[PDB]
Amino acid sequence: ADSDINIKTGTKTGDLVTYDKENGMHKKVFYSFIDDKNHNKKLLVIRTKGTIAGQYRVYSEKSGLAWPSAFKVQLQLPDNEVAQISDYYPRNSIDTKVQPDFKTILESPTDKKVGWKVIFNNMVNQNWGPYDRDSWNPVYGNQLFMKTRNGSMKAADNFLDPNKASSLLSSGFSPDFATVITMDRKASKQQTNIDVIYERVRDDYQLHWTSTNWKGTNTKDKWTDRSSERYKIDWEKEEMTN
């Protein structure tokens, strides 16, 4: 690459935390700068690190299963500010040809909003098929959390244990994502603003029994703990503070 073009090669940090008692979501960001007299302007980098707990629990006594259909994070900003959005690693890499269980996407990013949906793709349950987020079957319906086939105890006790399911459903998925935003250097004004609509697109798995064979049902987006926590970026001070 860099050698392929035969080029010689040549082309301040902090942290944050906050938690929601009702929805239970941990949120963080990290930044870094250089004082490069050769580079054009300042660059700030947003890491989405945190913990969107799955709250994989039987809220309702089939069982209604509050599970994370797709944790989604979007770093959205008001229009009036002069900022602009540049890079969004990870990108949707060319689907090259493996079916990962959480296929992260970079939802179609306009110049102002860029947001991933780290969705729940296939999960193998008790040595069987894919079972993606909207996994939905004629008989067994969705198939995220079917503890077993031939259960005998109380249905409330018959729900797939968090341990055996995908380790993200039980205890959430920490977002490992990032992106950056840009603007000319010699502009008088500086201010910006963020949205950071952290999402936990909840979904239901109802295993209802026919008297011949178990079934399943899914109530997609039955809730969404989209605890929108708008952030504050302090650019000139070379700090990020909520």
Ligand X SMILES: CCCCCCCCCC(=O)OC[C@H](COP(=O)(O)OCC[N+](C)(C)C)OC(=O)CCCCCCCCC
Binding site for ligand X (CB under 6 A): 149-150
**Residue 105 contact, options ligand X, a copy of itself, none, Cβ 5-8 Å cut-off depending on partner type:** a copy of itself
As a whole number of angstroms, the distance between CA 90 and CA 149 comes to 38
Residue 220 binds a copy of itself, judged by CB under 8 A: no
Q: How many residues does the chain have?
A: 242
Each residue 175-214 as x (binds a copy of itself by CB under 8 A) or -, in order, gives -x-x-x-x--------------------------------
**Least distance between a copy of itself and beta carbon 235 (Å):** 15
Q: Which of residues 122-151 bind a copy of itself (CB under 8 A)?
A: 122-124, 132-134
As a whole number of angstroms, the distance between CA 83 and CA 31 comes to 17
CB-based contacts of 36, cutoff 8 Å, min separation 6: none
**Residue 100 contact, options ligand X, a copy of itself, none, Cβ 5-8 Å cut-off depending on partner type:** a copy of itself
- For residue 237, the tally of other CB atoms under 10 A from its CB is 10
Residue 173 binds a copy of itself, judged by CB under 8 A: yes
Pairing of strands 199-206, 239-240: unpaired
User: What one-letter code names the amino acid at 95?
Assistant: D
**Least distance between a copy of itself and beta carbon 131 (Å):** 12
**Residue 149 contact, options a copy of itself, ligand X, none, Cβ 5-8 Å cut-off depending on partner type:** ligand X
**Residue 229 contact, options ligand X, a copy of itself, none, Cβ 5-8 Å cut-off depending on partner type:** none
As a whole number of angstroms, the distance between CA 67 and CA 78 comes to 31
Binding residues for a copy of itself, total number by CB under 8 A: 89
Q: Which of 23, 51, 76, 137 binds a copy of itself (CB under 8 A)?
A: 51
**Least distance between a copy of itself and beta carbon 63 (Å):** 18
104 within 8 A of 116, measured Cβ to Cβ = yes
Pairing of strands 115-119, 64-74: antiparallel
- For residue 92, the tally of other CB atoms under 10 A from its CB is 14
**Least distance between a copy of itself and beta carbon 106 (Å):** 6
